[PDB]
Structure 1
């Protein structure tokens, strides 16, 4: 694909099982063991693989080849031998945890640690508007929202900001084998950051989402087609969405 024009994607599930097939195959050839009986060139094993994932220039075809290597680690320790050798080949990571999965954040992504060299920031134009402010409003949340034991009361001061996070945390949860689109994402993210959900209850936002999403695909199909086509959320497109969330919030719970 990549050497002829198109765009490919490749998942290695996983790459901690392409290493113990090299440790065994090259111990019975009488090659002397290194650390944890791994050979000398396990770094050369993974590095000569993960550098073909290129992005060619446009005088060759312009094709791309993404790669998504999976790595299983023991007891959540990231300082092992084969993890650290492959953290430092990839541009960015997605740190999946266990206490996120069990408290309720599923997909259990540590959004604090999931750093990414942003890839010349090719997010998209409309998502930059709503998730630019979301990124900072969630970062503001995480610095200040870890007490679990309250003694004092500052509803004008602190309790307004942490009420914006739980509305944006419980928005971020998803199901399984039902992935959204990007303009269906711009709509549901618009309603969270613009204050249009602070009068709900957080145990009803997952219920609020599917009733909202079914209403916009059914009754507002020509709205979402101007976000996907024009790229940006324009100022007159900002105008039309201002009623739809408030008209639906007027008759959501009745």
Structure 2
């Protein structure tokens, strides 16, 4: 009964207004690119619309015709059609209304669940914040992976790069980072809440559905936006999805809040851009990518800033995901993005199969912020851990004397300490506890095949018996002398009792 009533509610409010609008005739349509004739006042990279309600962008302004790219399917556009200019640069909805919604590259709800109630729109192609608004990266972005929070820390406003081969665990790191923010978003203070945006570029719809259900299971869609431009979406959409998501995150960082955006991958945005550019007839470049392929990314990753307290104080972290071919980091797009981003997180298949998961290659992984953007407890402990692994990696290729034998023992203990599962990120204090136990010669007695058992049991024991100590470490944010003495006695007791 009420189904038809709510159906009518939609018609009751319509768009009566018909206006006198400028137009153009489609001289030629093919491969997703139209050549409109007319539109004498259409702007550059403006949004136009076709006779069937299908949108497009006027990318080329040639003297005789306008080269338009169609944001959708192309079979429905004929020759001699009509293109009406909307008189507005391409823009997307923004706001907290988008949280928990799966949307396409243009901000249209994709999961049903009604429409988006956004009250504001933002232009995708906005300039990055200047030099003055920013401020050095201060807070830590808690990722939940021990090896990332300890050895290659990420701040808020940094632009890490997750680069590896196919199926080494990049999207897994992204999902762990997204899921971990649940503890902060559930709390009270707004200075720690981090809203997450996941841009899925070129991934088949099944993968994005799996990801969305995984986030829902971990109850992580309360604060996550998913901008999906999947494989079957015309190239002009996969080219624009990163910019739409970055605008949705620019809103947060401009309104004093903190956001995290994860482009996944950028190596597929590059391919979509290449297809667009080749079908507009623009001359190719190296590997057929257009000349403006560095710009494409540099203008996009430069929007992940850390505003100073005069501009709200908000921040927007970025975690672009690149995909190399057989570890050839020396390729074109990988090198561009490596020279664009701050840090890197190298995942290697040789480490993935050797049992080290996440495969993070701590030897090559870097983070310019480093010291800054790390909690004091983690700063204290991960430093000694970093030195110990650095020494271990030198003498590792073989396998006598007591000193070097114990050095290898400690290195191996720490190595098996850094392993982890999927979608089970750890609180920072728990990571500190585990790493402290491992680095203070305690595990040197145990076998290295049992270190996982220890780690797990120790976590389960501490999370219940010694919740107070973990709360102390979190609140005070350092391993004070009394906290260190406690940690010492807890570890000494537990080790023997196991």
Question: TM-score normalised by the shorter chain: which range applies?
Answer: over 0.9
Cα 1:5–1:241 shift into 2, 3 Å:
same
1: CA distance, partners of 2:356 / 2:397: 16
1:155 Cα deviation (Å)? Answer: 3.0
- 1:46-100 deviation digits (Å, cap 9, x = unpaired): 1111111111111110100000100111111011111111111101100011000
Cα 1:167–1:119 shift into 2, 3 Å:
closer
1:248 maps to 494
Q: Secondary structure of 1:66's match?
A: strand
2: CA distance, partners of 1:108 / 1:67: 20
Runs of 4+ in 1 over 4 A off after TM superposition: none
- 1:163-222 deviation digits (Å, cap 9, x = unpaired): 001110000000001111011111111111111111111111101111111111111111
Q: Contact 2:284–2:290 (CA<8 Å) still a contact in 1?
A: yes
Q: Secondary structure of 1:109's match?
A: coil
1: CA distance, partners of 2:485 / 2:299: 52
1:119 Cα deviation (Å)? Answer: 5.3
Query: Could you tell me which of 460, 466, 470 is aligned with 1:214?
Result: 460
1: CA distance, partners of 2:456 / 2:403: 32
1:157 Cα deviation (Å)? Answer: 2.9
Per the normalisation by structure 1, the TM-score is: 0.94
Q: Contact 2:371–2:379 (CA<8 Å) still a contact in 1?
A: no
1: CA distance, partners of 2:293 / 2:352: 31
Cα 1:130–1:120 shift into 2, 3 Å:
closer
Q: Contact 2:417–2:451 (CA<8 Å) still a contact in 1?
A: yes
2: CA distance, partners of 1:4 / 1:119: 27
Q: Contact 2:389–2:411 (CA<8 Å) still a contact in 1?
A: yes
2: CA distance, partners of 1:60 / 1:140: 44
Cα 1:127–1:119 shift into 2, 3 Å:
closer
Q: Contact 2:473–2:479 (CA<8 Å) still a contact in 1?
A: yes
2: CA distance, partners of 1:145 / 1:56: 43
1: CA distance, partners of 2:416 / 2:375: 23
- 1:93-143 deviation digits (Å, cap 9, x = unpaired): 000110000000000010000011025622110111111110101101001
Unmatched segments (≥5 aa) in structure 1? 149-153
1:231 Cα deviation (Å)? Answer: 0.9
Cα 1:120–1:246 shift into 2, 3 Å:
closer
Cα 1:225–1:170 shift into 2, 3 Å:
same
- RMSD over aligned Cα, in angstroms? 1.1
Q: Secondary structure of 1:9's match?
A: strand
1: CA distance, partners of 2:439 / 2:343: 26
Greater displacement, 175-184 / 32-41: 32-41
Q: Which has the larger radius of gyration?
A: 2
Greater displacement, 139-148 / 60-69: 139-148
Q: Contact 2:259–2:315 (CA<8 Å) still a contact in 1?
A: yes
1:41 maps to 292
Aligned pairs, number:
247
Unmatched segments (≥5 aa) in structure 2? 1-251
Q: Secondary structure of 1:71's match?
A: strand
Q: Secondary structure of 2:330's match?
A: coil
Cα 1:51–1:167 shift into 2, 3 Å:
same
Q: Secondary structure of 1:142's match?
A: helix
2: CA distance, partners of 1:191 / 1:18: 44
Q: Secondary structure of 1:10's match?
A: strand
The structure carrying a bigger strand percent of its residues is 2
1: CA distance, partners of 2:487 / 2:273: 57
1: CA distance, partners of 2:445 / 2:277: 63
Q: Secondary structure of 1:88's match?
A: helix
Per the normalisation by structure 2, the TM-score is: 0.49
